[PDB]
């Protein structure tokens, strides 16, 4: 069991060595397009790159974007995992966005995070200011914005300007989980968790949501291995029958690195085995959720 488990590591002070043992079954596989010379200053981190088995390829000269499908047969959910857009991949974000079909945007990150530019600003902050990608003819719109106490939801509008569609893009920006920690609770994680599975952004008939943070694989790692968990488990209505390791290890057969630290991987535990309680019939510890993250 997750939870037999999860007390045994954390009596035998264990995490290291186990979060060790991941990184040394991780899967690995070639990058080489991510590696090309014309592809250098579309890489945010020379060490994070996207499979070549996985990346995502833009439709449109150069199909090239630090972006890798996260496909899970099993739990029947994909999730795109990108790197924070740079300047000049602002426009390859939105291209991407419209071509899969996502519905749904999580960023885990801020801009600017420990003295440093981690993302670009690749959304309007200000409804009468829209943004246009000139070299990918699209059009982005804020339309409205929910900011609660530690996390924020906004409303855009996605015009592509060639065929004149629009969609509505759900995002929903995480506001003080900083990298290789832990969130503050568990609470406040699938608080931000529950509202990204009720907009509706996580069903089968949108695209996959696309997940960042900096470099898309830590905190974004964190997110989508306790989502599938807890869908693994809803499936066969059965906690029981979920390893976690095996879930992480299957995740990294899509992109490098998922989980960058013990630390998340314990508090992946943490999560997963209280959204557990939510998943098997106690609807209620859902409100508990949102009273104890303070939301307003
Ligand atoms: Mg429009
Ligand atoms: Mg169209």
Not at 85 to 106: A, D, I, Y
Not at 110 to 133: H, N, T
Not at 212 to 237: Q, V, Y
């Amino acid at each position: 069991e997750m939870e037999k488990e999860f007390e045994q590591i954390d009596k035998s002070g264990s995490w290291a060595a186990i979060y060790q043992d991941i990184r040394h079954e991780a899967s690995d596989f070639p990058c080489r397009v991510a590696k090309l010379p014309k592809n250098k200053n579309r890489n945010r981190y020379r060490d994070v790159s996207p499979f070549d088995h996985s990346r995502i390829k833009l439709h449109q000269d150069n199909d090239y974007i630090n972006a890798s499908l996260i496909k899970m047969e099993e739990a029947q959910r994909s999730y795109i995992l990108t790197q924070g857009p740079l300047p000049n991949t602002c426009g390859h974000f939105w291209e991407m966005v419209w071509e899969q079909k996502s519905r749904g945007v999580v960023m885990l990150n801020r801009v600017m995070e420990k003295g440093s530019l981690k993302c670009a600003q690749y959304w309007p902050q200000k409804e009468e200011k829209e943004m246009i990608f000139e070299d990918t003819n699209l059009k982005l719109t804020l339309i409205s914005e929910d900011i609660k106490s530690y996390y924020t939801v906004r409303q855009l509008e996605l015009e592509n300007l060639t065929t004149q569609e629009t969609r509505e893009i759900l995002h929903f920006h995480y506001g003080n989980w900083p990298d290789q920690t832990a969130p503050e609770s568990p609470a406040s994680f699938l608080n931000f968790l529950f509202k990204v599975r009720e907009s509706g952004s996580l069903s089968p008939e949108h695209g996959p949501v696309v997940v960042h943070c900096s470099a898309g694989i830590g905190r974004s790692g964190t997110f989508c291995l306790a989502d599938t968990c807890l869908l693994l488990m809803d499936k066969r209505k059965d906690p029981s029958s979920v390893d976690i390791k095996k879930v992480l290890l299957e995740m990294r057969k899509f992109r490098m690195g998922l989980i960058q630290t013990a630390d998340q991987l314990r508090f992946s535990y943490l999560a997963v085995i209280e959204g557990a309680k939510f998943i098997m019939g106690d609807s209620s510890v859902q409100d508990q959720w949102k009273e104890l993250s303070h939301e307003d």
